[PDB]
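Try it yourself: sequence plus adenosine-5'-triphosphate, in.
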Amino acid sequence: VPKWIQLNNEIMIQKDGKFQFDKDKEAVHSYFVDYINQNTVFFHNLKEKLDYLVENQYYEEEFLSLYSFEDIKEVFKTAYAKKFRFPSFMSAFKFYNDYALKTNDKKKILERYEDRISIVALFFANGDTEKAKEYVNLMINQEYQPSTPTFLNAGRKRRGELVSCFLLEVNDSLNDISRAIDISMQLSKLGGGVSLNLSKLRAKGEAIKDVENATKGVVGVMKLLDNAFRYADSGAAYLNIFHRDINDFLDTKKISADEDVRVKTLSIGVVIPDKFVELAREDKAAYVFYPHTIYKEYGQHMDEMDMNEMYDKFVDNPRVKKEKINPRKLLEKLAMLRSESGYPYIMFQDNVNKVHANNHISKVKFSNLCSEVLQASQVSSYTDYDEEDEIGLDISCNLGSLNILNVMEHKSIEKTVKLATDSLTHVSETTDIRNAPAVRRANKAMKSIGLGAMNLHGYLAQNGIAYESPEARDFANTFFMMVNFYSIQRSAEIAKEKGETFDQYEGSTYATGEYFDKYVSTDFSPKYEKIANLFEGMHIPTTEDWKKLKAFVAEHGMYHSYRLCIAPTGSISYVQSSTASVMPIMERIEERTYGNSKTYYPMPGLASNNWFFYKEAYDMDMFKVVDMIATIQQHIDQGISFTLFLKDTMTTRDLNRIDLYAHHRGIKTIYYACLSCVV
Amino acid sequence: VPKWIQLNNEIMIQKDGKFQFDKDKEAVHSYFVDYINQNTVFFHNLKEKLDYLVENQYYEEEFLSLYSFEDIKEVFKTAYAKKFRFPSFMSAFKFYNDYALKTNDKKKILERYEDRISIVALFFANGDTEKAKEYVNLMINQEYQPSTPTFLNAGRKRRGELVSCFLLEVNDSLNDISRAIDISMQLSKLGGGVSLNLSKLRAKGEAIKDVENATKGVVGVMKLLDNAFRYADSGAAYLNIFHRDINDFLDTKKISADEDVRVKTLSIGVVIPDKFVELAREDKAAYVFYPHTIYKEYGQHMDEMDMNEMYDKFVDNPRVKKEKINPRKLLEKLAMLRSESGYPYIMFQDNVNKVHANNHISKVKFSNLCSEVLQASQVSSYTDYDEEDEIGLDISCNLGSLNILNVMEHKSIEKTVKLATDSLTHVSETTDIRNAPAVRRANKAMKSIGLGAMNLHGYLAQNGIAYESPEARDFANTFFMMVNFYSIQRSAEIAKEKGETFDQYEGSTYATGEYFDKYVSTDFSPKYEKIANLFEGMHIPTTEDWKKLKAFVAEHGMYHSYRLCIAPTGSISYVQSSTASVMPIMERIEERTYGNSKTYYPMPGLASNNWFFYKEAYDMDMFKVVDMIATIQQHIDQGISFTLFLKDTMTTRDLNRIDLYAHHRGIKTIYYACLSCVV
Ligand SMILES: Nc1ncnc2c1ncn2[C@@H]1O[C@H](COP(=O)(O)OP(=O)(O)OP(=O)(O)O)[C@@H](O)[C@H]1O
Ligand SMILES: Nc1ncnc2c1ncn2[C@@H]1O[C@H](COP(=O)(O)OP(=O)(O)OP(=O)(O)O)[C@@H](O)[C@H]1O
Ligand SMILES: Cc1cn([C@H]2C[C@H](O)[C@@H](COP(=O)(O)OP(=O)(O)OP(=O)(O)O)O2)c(=O)[nH]c1=O
Ligand SMILES: Cc1cn([C@H]2C[C@H](O)[C@@H](COP(=O)(O)OP(=O)(O)OP(=O)(O)O)O2)c(=O)[nH]c1=O
Ligand SMILES: Nc1ncnc2c1ncn2[C@@H]1O[C@H](COP(=O)(O)OP(=O)(O)O)[C@@H](O)[C@H]1O
Ligand SMILES: Nc1ncnc2c1ncn2[C@@H]1O[C@H](COP(=O)(O)OP(=O)(O)O)[C@@H](O)[C@H]1O
Ligand SMILES: [Mg+2]
Ligand SMILES: [Mg+2]
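Structure, out:
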């Protein structure tokens, strides 16, 4: 057993009752000197390194050719000037095991952490050598972490797509079903996570032409999709809760499900308008609808109509066919299934669209794997082979997360937010997906990005603030207000600089101005003095600054239809020495076995004198956590991946009381505690 | 229990030891007077009938509008002038239960047998009122029976496609696989039987781009197709025996197969070049090949190269990857699987192409469900969404069968063959399949039809000739030579009349003349005197008549790339009072239960003084049956659906000796004893 693993395990051998937290500094030092340095290829110079990496098909050539090699050396030297040292064993282990470029034979290390960062920065900057330096500092200071698809792939040949998260609409025809199968496979082949909205497909037992009772329904298309994802080397189906197939749709995922209906590689999500929550509260028998009878009567997809306005009219219309269900029992079934599998991802549709800026394009109808992407979409119609198709708007989103601790300590909320936006904008403009025409069309038209945040709990716990406290909410309220301020400002700056807005921007609430109403009348500076001290050195936007930004946007518009969403953070959380996303930590010390050895990872910053503040999520009040997320969500235009942390000693009514409380507080999406759609 | 069922069962109550065969004449009379006539809607006139059937969306309007109603009445009266009476209970039962148009509520009969025939004839004739009369007589005399898809659908609204048999090529890309899934569903939705050639897909464990060992292989695409056919309301996959996946391909159909690999709605067929049969005979270890390594080396699909020429070169080429197998044991496995399921349909590829007329277009590479369609094909390439596709040639075939007994008694071999061709040509020209571009392109370019024959055994047994006798072969030799003569002659007549040939006709052996070599040097008039007497009244083509037809074709060409194939005959065999296809009868008397009653159907014409000639197939020598089929096959340009009739007391070596003997005798396809691809 290696020496770094020896010192690593010595954390768990207590001294004066205290753990040996300092042993992990030795462990990662031993891990480098006695291993990493000896398997890292070292060239006589950097040009020799880059020429080798280019000539051996490791790196791409075009993006490097935009720089004079004297500039590439300055950028690399900027990365190494930091003298970055991983503070823990698992942080360095995860980077070299998951991210560092290895040789084709997987024997030696080609990239140090400074190398991957320099290459990504050279890619983002697109020739601007000083900007490349800015990106290097931003990443080497660990202020910003682009998503794994971007951070891992930028600058490679054989490089996968930098975006790997996609959402698809599916129209109610065999032609469209066939095209969705192929698109799913085309994206999944590229490593993408694909979520499809099935709410427009007619329900089981609806007519085809004049043959009554002919349709397989949603479960039939799920079976085809399940197989498509199996063949092409993870997908999701969403369904509106008022769709007649909702029960059958859910039952495909019961762990006891019969194999005739079983679907094994599809996640599921459920879309819940306010009207359903009211019916459930009142314990009144509800109706679910056969969507094609609604289409034949109203000429519109049920999915494109306002169920809060239309429910009673659908019920009274004799040409609309429906079924009676028990809304409380359906709500209970959603709790049971999430205890089994985490998902169904639950989306409170009216909590999304109440504050949605682009309802003029469409209401938000569904979300992605792990349910943080919330954007408008419009269904295509792929017609017969000899006819032109009608290309709509699907969704793809490009992700990154700033690191709250390092942003606060560097007092760089503005600079990080604006710079990270520039990078996500570059990934959006260099993406051209083939074989997904509505994804490609939407990416150019909508120009949407998704900037998030990680290390919320870690930063709070290291500054003496409990995750569940009202002080924690007071910090989050202010911090994310500021993130949103500078995000909107940078999007308008890019719109002025380029002279473009996203397509149909002038119909958005950004252009008509009501987006800014709460920001010009309400102040979001800290109510607690000790929280205000954390922001010392950074100007906090006032209602007056918001009035001037409102006016600025009104003159120049905005480049991005969407800017912010908070995805989960996977392995990269280790590399960042950061608690995952904005969630509370799960364990104070993680024990995982790797290759016949047990490794220990205490939470980033865990000491004996802050033990109390690293409170484990399962011991927290989920109602207080809901309050925290609802506070962050005020200033995020898309969504927040939100996993409830529950003990098995929870009755099904306790579970639904959380659901109802989350809906009450304005939460957009929720599930219980996705690789392509995480940072 | 009804009276017709009473008299029907009285056949089986013997008199002087003899069955009561005459009781079935009473049964079908009782079946009409006491039931059929009372549930048949009778209008005051025919215009009242047709107007009702048009106005109630039963019939189509366009084809009837091509006639003046005085002419429609003459055509209908021509049908009724025959005073056609069904000679047996089951013949009338099958027509009214399976073919006669009933009301939307399925309560009363709208069509008598004379009505369906008149409508089909009016459809075929396309305005020519005298031709409509010719079609009426041809069908009411039961000289010709168009296939069930055509006979059932012609003249309807809500009418399904008149062709329902299709064959598809699939290219080696994800794009092509996705298009084949959709095409399969588009055709299957229309009621089609779809067979796909999977021999071009790269084998399991081949590279994708530069990722080695990445491919699922043929079984992966079979699983997708299996699901496609399940969703869209029967298909087939063919594979060349030299494909590396052949064993895995076969194992998907073992009745004991694990569900991870199980395929439940796909038939399978295997394509066997001569080189494999030689390797099996010699008991020499054979090789199967990874087709993509062959493609990367030779630039051609293994499926498009001559394995008899290339086998040793493939084996010696170090850049071609292969696997060793046991050819004898593989041949044995094909016998086992056919005992289980009937198929794998076995195709002896060189027995097809040795006598194939259009090798210049392509070799024949695969066949259909029940394996009688044998035509050239060329693979498409469906490229990325933004790029033009390359449309190749798939296959569809339009079927019918003449009734040998009635053709011989009416001495109408010429008139039936030429008239049936005209009808199959009309079905071909009125077919426009959407969403299958290579099927549509091939149908116009190739103009192929498939005329067959039924009632061979019945006709032989009723003229004192045993199915296994050399006299039976002597009759078949002459009869089908004549069918082929007048078929070729009518195809050339249509080519002169229209001034067109099928595309690239001048590369065929019809144009270069070697097709006719055996017909200008060998006489095919009967060797047996009693067989020659059967043809009295009809001129038998001589070598001189063939020389003049050869010259005729050389001047005018031919309209049809393919003309003849002998499909199985399903329920319509009853309606025709005909033994199935050209096969020997299976049972002298069929006992089947329908609705709590047992029905009896003795073979068409079975009497006590011809009992010996209705010898049951399972008591026959399959080697003599192979001889019979090989004799018919000389004069059929496509294939013959050929089911072996075997007792379970057959060793696996006995089974392979039949296979080897069938190959020896030139048989093209074979399996053991399809609805969309039967007449
Ligand atoms: N394999 C490598 N070998 C050498 N330098 C590398 C390598 N990988 C990255 N670098 C980085 O490239 C930069 C320049 O490296 P190089 O050794 O060519 O220059 P130097 O000797 O440090 O400086 P100067 O140009 O003044 O000689 C340094 O920041 C170094 O850390
Ligand atoms: N339901 C039906 N009622 C009447 N005739 C029918 C019907 N179905 C088919 N036919 C056929 O239509 C043809 C003409 O029928 P119709 O009764 O109108 O004429 P008709 O009285 O026999 O002759 P004519 O025109 O000299 O009066 C006949 O051959 C008849 O068998
Ligand atoms: C994408 C994909 C293809 N395949 C199959 C389908 C095809 O038979 C083959 C890949 O064909 P293609 O889709 O044509 O792949 P490619 O063009 O990117 O790469 P290459 O140049 O090597 O053709 O492998 C899989 O087995 N799994 C997959 O996920
Ligand atoms: C063809 C087919 C469709 N479907 C589904 C797919 C679609 O959701 C719907 C049929 O859509 P379509 O493919 O659009 O059918 P259509 O246009 O011929 O008929 P209609 O005018 O009624 O749309 O039913 C099946 O369930 N099984 C099938 O076999
Ligand atoms: N925690 C660490 N993170 C990153 N690199 C490390 C770490 N520990 C050691 N190394 C690498 O090992 C080299 C030798 O280690 P050492 O001599 O202890 O440090 P230094 O270079 O500061 O004197 C360092 O220059 C560095 O490249
Ligand atoms: N075997 C049969 N096939 C067809 N139709 C039949 C048959 N037997 C009876 N029918 C129908 O029943 C009608 C009345 O039968 P019947 O009086 O016995 O015959 P016919 O009309 O020759 O005198 C016939 O006109 C005919 O339409
Ligand atoms: Mg439709
Ligand atoms: Mg390819």
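One thing you can check immediately is this: Residues 15 and 44 of chain A are 45 Å apart (CA to CA).
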